[PDB]
Amino acid sequence: NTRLRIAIQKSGRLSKESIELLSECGVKMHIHEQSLIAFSTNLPIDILRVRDDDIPGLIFDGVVDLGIIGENVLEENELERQSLGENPSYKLLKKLDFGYCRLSLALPQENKFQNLKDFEGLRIATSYPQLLKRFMKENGINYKNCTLTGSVEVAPRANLADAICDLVSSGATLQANNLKEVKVIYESRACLIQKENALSKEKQALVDKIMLRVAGVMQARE
Template sequence: MAEDTINLLKDCQLAVHKPNPRQYIASISSLPGLEVWFQRASDVVRKIRAGDVDLGIVGYDMVCEYGEDDDDLIVVHDALGFGECHLALAIPTSGIFENISSVSELAAMKHWSPERPLRIVTGYTHLGKKFVDKIGLKHVRLLTADGALEAAPAMGTADAILDLVSSGTTLRENSLKEIEGGTVLQSQGVLVASKRSLLLRETALDKTHEILERLEAHLRAKNQFTVTANMRGNSKDEVAERILLNTEFHGLQGPTICPVFSKMNGSVLENYYAIIICVTKHRLYDAVKQLRKIGGSGVLVSPLTYIFDEEPPRWRMLLDKLNQ
């Protein structure tokens, strides 16, 4: 998460300067007056709640587990695009669980009693307790461990686990499976803040605004290409009509169309137009095909770095949450 966070900030022109690897304090030269502290994910949330730091970047799972529903915590950006995983219940694929494929089937098993509860090992006791209550599992004991939870069922120290799953490889390699209704939450990296800080300290709100704007502009641009193509035509209106009526690709507000001037037999002609549109990466080839069909040639594709649009919706949402 730390590496992903540093890379993301760098891509947003917010490079984190850390004088040496064993130092936990750093700075961002484009944000003077801001201190960066490297802390364990759980401590990031605890320190925001305690009022020691104003803003943090952590997994949403950490915000929920260590935030314990504290309404001072406010998620400023909920999808930073890394650390994607989900918190889920998993049970062994064989033995008494062989035919169990949902939480209702798990709850209905006759094996669990006050003397012999279902033992679930997890690092997420707050979320685990809430989840067990929600799904109505009666005879349960939550056990805690810090890591390698997937080994517990085979070791005989627990019956089930509640842990993060990403690719699913760790579960599979340890003969465990997820079950229907067993997902507690979806998680990825988020930017989280203390509501109190943002309300009481104008500089904290200003810096948050700048960071959010940069994140939004970069993340919006990340999956887009700028596509430029030349197209023969008699006027820009005619070219615009061809694009708007015959393709699905129109740019942010609409295509930008500019005349291309060429020299022929001593005179300057305006019989080509350059069109500029934005295209999501996975639809690039569709866009090229559609542009070709309406006479597009010389298609140039370049990556987009930022899209600064009007005020980002997340900023408005943040102000609403702060009642401003």
């Protein structure tokens, strides 16, 4: 394949802004809402619409050339792959101006929080077990893991966990579930990444051209 492959989230919080960024950089495209493959109508570019969780691996494995992903999901999967004894690698091209959030430890509102030591021995529900594990190890706090892919915020009220480690932007979900944010462990935004192995001279020149436009678009949006 001589067409550049770019992976983006098929459906979720990054989808609309990923597509808009590309169009604003002059990548015109044809999208069918329920389909894996979309393509560019004016440039030699294929757009792969996938579950966001898959994007880091597709870049690490060299299946696609570029990807737009939240830093949180990138780092979680990098840590996973390293812990499996692999050597995931990627180039960070740009931190983007959307997808802001923070991965934070949160406790029930009525809870005594003085200190990080207050998490000692607690069951902590999260979709980010590697990120959580690393933070807690680095701070010398022992805990019990509960991995849930969704509905993390309901785990305490369901008595499955004492606390959560979950993504927060506005804080409305925490408040709706009578939880309070006590400690940020990771700050995230969407980023543009590239696979490790060198592209052809033609594909790299196309990436270079796109990157100049990304920069110009972000400057014009301030």
